Structure 1
């Protein structure tokens, strides 16, 4: 209880709770956004969607509906028993159509999981993470002004990863990515 309590108090001293919903107009055509816009699944094949400019056509990504240009913000994501996921932030100006490698140099700050047990930060090169207990819920923490993106196990307060401090260019968006077709959705925790 003490580690959860200190995690709650820290998030109150410093970070504004963001109420993040998924924008279906940004979602790759293989993704399904839930009607309440909190949950994400994958289809067996691309669905028939317009190719509007905001849509990720290659990467299996979706954005939030609000961006950040300043300030300290957090949100929490129920990854549950998923075997695969990536979450974090990206710049408004990322390449959405052509492939680009999802790295900080290309405007992406994400961590995640592959093959049930391989936790990685998508630094370049990728950082192999050591996680003592697989997180069911992950907190994403942004400080725009200091260039900080960090990740915690939201249930026990343990730290997962902090990217090197950087300089952002333009607005940042919450980003979510799933590659697999598996029973458990990715779900955003309401603020």
Structure 2
């Protein structure tokens, strides 16, 4: 792909984070802690899952960023509406305001409803995410495999400002402690 020149500097919004997450000083890395991280509750925090939003809001234009997923067993990545539900249980779907892919149990899937199987020959260590607001497109790229396409959501109905979306996943297995990292431009 040739989307790299739309690169944006994403930072994580502490206020939106699940209370077990640990975000680095530079706001560029996040991991699952082994306990509550001693923050007050607020209506922005994702309560049920290890999720956090980027601080940046997008309502026009083309945007690109990259995320490092090295040695993780589970994660979700993409974008979402600023007004997605924070509390309780929900599915990641465009109907609920999410445009995402994930790794789960050794398979990759796109967060359609129902979910869609992805075909990845080279397990990615870094994921590229491209948003074209005007066109209604969200695309995912395999940076480890020379930028090959993973998935395109088209005919997107964003219906609001968009925020970068992250889920570090649970660590029930003891094999999923590694962070998500926003990669330098």
With normalisation by structure 1, the TM-score equals 0.89
Q: Secondary structure of the equivalent of 2:95? A: helix
Q: Secondary structure at the match of 1:87?
A: strand
- Return the alpha-carbon distance in structure 2 between the equivalents of residues 144 and 123 of structure 1: 19
1:91 equivalent to 2:91? Answer no
Partner of 1:133: 122
User: How far, CA to CA, are the matches of 1:39 and 1:122 in structure 2?
Assistant: 23
Runs of 4+ in structure 1 off by over 6 angstroms are none
Distance in structure 2 (CA, Å) of the matches to 1:49 and 1:132: 41
| Selected match of 2:131 from 126, 142, 146 | 142
Aligned residues of 1:51 and 1:57 also touching (Cα < 8 A): no
In the alignment, the residues of structure 2 paired with residue 124 and residue 112 of structure 1 have an alpha-carbon distance, to the nearest angstrom, of: 14
Show the counterpart of 2:179. 185
| Corresponding pairs, count | 180
User: CA-to-partner distance for each residue in 1:81-110, whole Å, 9 max, x for gaps?
Assistant: 211111000001101113221111000111
List runs of 5+ in structure 1 lacking aligned partners.
1-6
User: Aligned in 2, Cα 1:59/1:183: closer, same or farther, shift over 3 Å?
Assistant: closer
Contact 2:52 2:167 (8 Å CA) reproduced: yes
Aligned residues of 1:20 and 1:190 also touching (Cα < 8 A): no
* TM-score (norm. length: structure 2): 0.91
Q: Please name the residue that 1:120 is paired with.
A: 109
Superimposed CA distance per residue, residues 118-143 of structure 1 (whole angstroms, 9 cap, x where no aligned partner): 10111100001110100111000001
CA distance in 2, matches of 1:98, 1:114: 21
The answer (yes or no) to whether the contact 1:56–1:96 under 8 Å persists in 2 is: yes
Paired with 1:81 and 1:92, the residues of 2 have a C-alpha distance of 29
Q: CA deviation at 1:178?
A: 1.7
Question: What does residue range 47-86 of structure 1 map to in structure 2 within 5 Å?
Answer: 47-86=37-76
Structure 2: distance between partners of 1:51 and 1:184: 25
SS of equivalent to 1:159: strand
CA distance in structure 2 between the partners assigned to 1:107 and 1:183 by the alignment: 27
Encode CA deviations 1:47-94: one digit per residue, 9 max, x unaligned.
Answer: 332222221112321011111000110100011121111100000110
